[PDB]
Each structure stands twice: as structure tokens, then as C-alpha cells.
Amino acid sequence: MIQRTPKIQVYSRHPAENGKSNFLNCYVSGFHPSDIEVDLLKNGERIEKVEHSDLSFSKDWSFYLLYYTEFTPTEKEEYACRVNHVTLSQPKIVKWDRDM
């Protein structure tokens, strides 16, 4: 058996074909086993509609998840990604740095 803690990066992107739109991304990488729970949060509350969830693997024991959706942030709002995984004794919350 092998288990590996996910790395978690939270960042924003504008698709080049539609630069006015903005997407909040949580990239959860290199984890095993594949069982996992991932949410985007706004002011600590789960965002129910997340329109993209793309899972892949490299080696049979390394998984990658890009979890992202359109958003329109204001400076007073806090966004984050919350991950639960067997390697994590408590949920890991990674805040979105608004300059990223």
C-alpha cells in the first residue's frame, strides 16, 4: 500500500478567449488513495455549483484533481479550498491569496 498527502494550490485564471470571466481553481495533486473530498468555500461556506471537476492519474498510485468554477470576487470576500483525505487528520483549508 502507499498513501500520499495531496498538495493543494488555490488560484484564479481568466480564459484567454473570454478574459472578462474569472475562475477560482483548486488543484489537488499527487495524492493516494484516490478517495477524497474537495470543496470551494466562500466566506467559509461550501460553494454548491462547481462546474468543472477533472480527475486524472499518472502512475497508478498518483491522482490529480482540478476543481474549478466561474466566480466574481470582491475584496471583502474570502475564498478557499477545503480538502479531506485519509492522510489529513483534520480538513485542510487553503485560503485563496487574492493576488494569485
Author numbering: 0 to 99
From the article:
To strengthen this hypothesis, four mutations were inserted at position 76: D76A, D76E, D76H, and D76K. While D76K resulted too unstable to be purified, the other three variants were structurally and biophysically characterized. The crystal structures of D76A, D76E, and D76H were determined to high resolution. Analogously to the structure of D76N2, these structures do not show any major conformational change compared to wt β2m. However, although the backbone of the EF loop is well superimposable between the structures of wt β2m and the mutants, changing the residue in position 76 alters the H-bond network within the loop, in particular in D76A and D76E. The last three C-terminal residues (residues 97–99) are the only stretch undergoing some rearrangement upon mutation at position 76. The side chain of Arg97 presents different conformations, and the strength of its interactions with the EF loop and to Trp95 varies in different mutants; residue Met99 interacts with Ser11 or with Arg12. Such observations suggest a role for residue 76 in determining the interactions within the EF loop and with β2m C-terminal region. Similarly to the D76N mutant, all three mutants display a decreased stability and increased aggregation propensity, confirming the key role played by position 76 in determining β2m biophysical properties. A saturation site mutagenesis (D76 to E, H, and A) allowed us to show here how position 76 is indeed crucial in the β2m fold, any mutation at this position results in a notable decrease in thermal stability and a remarkable increase in aggregation propensity as observed for D76N.
